[PDB]
Every structure is written in C-alpha cells, then in structure tokens.
Amino acid sequence: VNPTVFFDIAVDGEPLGRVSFELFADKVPKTAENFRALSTGEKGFGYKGSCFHRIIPGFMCQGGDFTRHNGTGGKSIYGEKFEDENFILKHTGPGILSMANAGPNTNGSQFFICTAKTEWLDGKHVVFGKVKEGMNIVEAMERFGSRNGKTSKKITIADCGQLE
C-alpha cells in the first residue's frame, strides 16, 4: 500500500539511470503525500526538470528546490512550509529519504538522500522514505559531488512519477 515513486536521473542531459523510492505513507502520511504529489506533478508543479544542487560524497545528495535551483527555494503542496509531522523514523544508513528544513516546522519541497548513517539528524529532520531500487545510481551521482557540495556536472531529474 506504500507508494513507490521514480526519478530518472540525467547528468549534463545524458541519461544516467533510475532510482525508485518507497514512501512511508503509513508512518508519515502528510509528508509522504507531499513528495508523491510533487513527483507526479499532479498539482501543477513539482520535481520534473529540477536539479540536485548539493552533493557531498559520503554524506548525502540534496535536491527539490524547483523554484530557485540552489537551496533557497521550493514549496510544498500545502503552502510555503508545513510542520514536522513526527520523528518516528531515524537516519539508519544509506538510502534514507529525509526532509531538509531551516528550523522547526519549516518543511517545503527540499529533501536529501543520505549516503551514510546520519544519526545526528534524528529528531530534527523528518524521515519519510527509502531507496528501493537503484541505490547504485545514487552512488554514481555521489561521484559528481565535492566536499563543499558543488557538483561538477548538472544532475537533473529528467522525469519522475509514480510506479505503484
């Protein structure tokens, strides 16, 4: 019953591969639905065509800013920001999907895929999904990142939607 969402990733316009995610709609329903709707674009906006603006190898890949493409923008389906739904799920290793924020109850559309165990984020960032297929694609994305987060090539969501 948990939805599965796909991203097709492109590096400088050249296809790279497909990552799919399970969204914990049972454990965090308000958070998951935000991500699901932004991935299908069914509300008229969303992730299709947006980039991964910050990639730090051995830490995480961060994306979802579809309005300013640099970490300062984005918005949720509910409005500019929404609350921290709960912190039931923890950052337990690579593949975890978690919300970026700027303080309590400031979720928008930005997210990060963890490429490490990031336990110091527990209780501050809402975990809402996990990579199901294509962890190897995420590892390939990581190699375009750098220590300060700047990417050497443009990493874009060329297409995205719901698989089930």
Curated annotation (Swiss-Prot):
> Which GO biological process categories is it annotated with?
activation of protein kinase B activity; apoptotic process; cell adhesion molecule production; cellular response to oxidative stress; endothelial cell activation; leukocyte chemotaxis; lipid droplet organization; negative regulation of oxidative stress-induced intrinsic apoptotic signaling pathway
Q: PROSITE patterns, per this entry?
A: CSA_PPIASE_1, CSA_PPIASE_2
Q: What is the effect of changing residue 59 to A?
A: Loss of ability to stimulate MAPK/ERK phosphorylation
Q: How is it modified after translation?
A: Acetylation at Lys-124 markedly inhibits catalysis of cis to trans isomerization and stabilizes cis rather than trans forms of the HIV-1 capsid. PPIA acetylation also antagonizes the immunosuppressive effects of cyclosporine by inhibiting the sequential steps of cyclosporine binding and calcineurin inhibition. Acetylation at Lys-124 favors its interaction with TARDBP.
- Where are residues bearing Phosphoserine located in the sequence? 76
Q: Which residues are glycosylated?
A: 107
Q: One short Pfam family name for this protein? A: Pro_isomerase
What keywords does the record list, in alphabetical order?
Answer: Acetylation, Apoptosis, Cytoplasm, Glycoprotein, Host-virus interaction, Isomerase, Isopeptide bond, Nucleus, Phosphoprotein, Rotamase, Secreted, Ubl conjugation
Where exactly is the Glycyl lysine isopeptide (Lys-Gly) (interchain with G-Cter in ubiquitin) cross-link placed along the chain? 27
**Where are the Phosphothreonine modifications?**
92
Mutagenesis or variant effect for residue 112 to A: Reduced ability to stimulate MAPK/ERK phosphorylation
Modification type N6-acetyllysine: residues: 27, 43, 75, 81, 124, 130, 132
Q: Which domain of life is it from?
A: Eukaryota
How is the quaternary structure described? Answer: Interacts with protein phosphatase PPP3CA/calcineurin A. Interacts with PRPF19 isoform 2 (via N-terminus). Interacts with isoform 2 of BSG/CD147. Interacts with FOXO1; the interaction promotes FOXO1 dephosphorylation, nuclear accumulation and transcriptional activity. Interacts with integrin ITGA2B:ITGB3; the interaction is ROS and peptidyl-prolyl cis-trans isomerase (PPIase) activity-dependent and is increased in the presence of thrombin. Interacts with MAP3K5.
Similarity comment: family membership:
Belongs to the cyclophilin-type PPIase family. PPIase A subfamily.
Q: What's the protein here called?
A: Peptidyl-prolyl cis-trans isomerase A
